[PDB]
Amino acid sequence: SEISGNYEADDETLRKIRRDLLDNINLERRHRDLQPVYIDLTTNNISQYYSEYLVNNEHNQDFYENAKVRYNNLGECELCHITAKFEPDADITKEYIYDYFMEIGYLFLESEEEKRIILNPANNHIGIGVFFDEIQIVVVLILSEKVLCIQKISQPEQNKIEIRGKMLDENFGIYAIRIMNVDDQKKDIKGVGPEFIEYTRSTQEWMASFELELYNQDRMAIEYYTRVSPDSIPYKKKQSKNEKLTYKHLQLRLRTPFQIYPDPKYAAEDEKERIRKEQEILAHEEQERKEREENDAKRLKQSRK
Amino acid sequence: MDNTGKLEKQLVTLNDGLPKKPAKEIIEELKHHLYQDFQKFFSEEKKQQYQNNFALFDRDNDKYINLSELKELLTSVNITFPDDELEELYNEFCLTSPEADGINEDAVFIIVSKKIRDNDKDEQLTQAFKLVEKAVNDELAKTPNETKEQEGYIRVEQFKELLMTLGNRWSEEQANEFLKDINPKSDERINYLDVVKKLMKR
Amino acid sequence: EEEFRLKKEQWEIQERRKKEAARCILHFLMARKEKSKKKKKKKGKKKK
């Protein structure tokens, strides 16, 4: 307070922190023919939780699996953790925050286990969680392998949902879209098959069009299912009302809590950051363009010998 | 080269590390979360008052009550429970209480907590219906030449975005069955009154 | 004075909470029972 005021983290600042962590891991991947890691909201949430816990505690896996059971995790997910203090004589502000997070990212870059796992070709989904205290900052990752990847989750209309996702598995297509109550899994919540799914085999991109109104919208998770033979999947077929889809033959893939992906704040902040990036970069490219122009002007004089 | 395929299947294994911890610790942690969500909405006064219906009925003074005592407590707290549901819950409670022929004073707390969670979800559902009807009426007022018959009837595209607001989330893939259950009559227009009727039928 | 008045209103609220606690306290010993029978005489004269 008087001497040590509270260091309440900027929500915008931490959002940029994790976004830049993801982009940096994507660059590291692209360095050697590796696809950038995509955004997994469930892994992002779990990593945020574990980073918050780690900042004043130590690496604990029991809490990790307890959170897994709480969120009903699906698929194998591998965890990464680092807890690096702050330098005893290092000054701290936003700029030092950004630079310290980049340095911690590099420290991740110099770990062979961490470099392998966070760049292992086996998995295709990445999530980041960052937290900090008076002393140290904790950075944690969750890596998951899934068949169907989430790419967009927005709000088209007042009461229209619109979520787009590209299928990462060529032999599996989005045939089942159903979910069970996170609080009471036994209770049939909601789901349908291909009568409202637009799937492109050539691109493996599937889009969902459905209906849904305002009831209890905070504290449960998704149940992403997949089935073999997307070709055998009757996409966009108006099935007779006397037939019900059989989801037991359908294999679940990805139990994910539901949140704005991307959240308007997240995407808007990323847009602003990138756009300022290109503006300053174009000023830069003007700087070196005029530099080369005048250098060649001097060279034409020096070419008088 | 030649862009050799290929269609390959990545086994999505549900191998999410079943806990190695003793199950007793996990059950204790779930009990702790139950206590947390109980104190969340249960105020200190209600928390201090609900015990007014357990002990004396607990005649043997060893902190237990049977079905009759639990039902008497529930009626004494001014909120009732079903006979079959009460029997189901009590037998489930006794499953882990082999040496006790009754439920503890915390058993009534947990029963009331779950009942209140369910009921409050119900009032949240009702309030959401009222708000959705208000929004639909406002949008209709935005169009001064649309038939009032649509009052209570909504379009396909105005029936999708309302599960990102509050309470206990329904995600993307939680928005397909109830359409089939209602079965719009080949008209792509849905009545939220039908939803009111069908949500509470389970 | 305002801080102390808020605290004492909280005091009244928690006093009523404790009154409900007592209401739940008069509720524990209906009939039982089993005769703590024999002897507790010895009360050594060294007193308070």
Residue numbers in the entry:
A (entry chain P): 104 to 408
B (entry chain R): 1 to 202
C (entry chain K): 387 to 434
Publication text:
In this study, we revealed the molecular architecture of the N-DRC of T. thermophila by an integrative modeling approach. Importantly, our data identified an additional N-DRC component, DRC12. Loss of DRC3 in the drc3 mutant strain led to the loss of part of the distal domain (based on our study, the distal domain lost in the drc3 mutant represents DRC9/10 complex). We propose DRC3 binds to DRC4 first, leading to the assembly of DRC9/10 heterodimers. As a result, DRC4 plays a crucial role in assembling the N-DRC distal domain. Regulatory signals can be sent to dynein e through the N-terminus of DRC9. In addition, DRC10 may send signals to dynein g through DRC3. Therefore, the DRC9/10 coiled-coil may be the important regulatory hub in the N-DRC that regulates dyneins g and e by receiving the signal from CCDC96/113. In active cilia, the N-DRC linker region is not well observed by cryo-ET, probably because of its flexibility.
Ciliary motility is regulated by the conserved nexin-dynein regulatory complex (N-DRC), which links adjacent doublet microtubules and regulates and coordinates the activity of outer doublet complexes. The N-DRC is a large 1.5-MDa, ~50-nm-long Y-shaped complex with two main regions: the base plate and linker regions. The N-DRC bridges neighboring DMTs and restricts sliding motions between DMTs. Here, using cryo-electron microscopy in conjunction with biochemical cross-linking and integrative modeling, we localize 12 DRC subunits in the N-DRC structure of Tetrahymena thermophila.
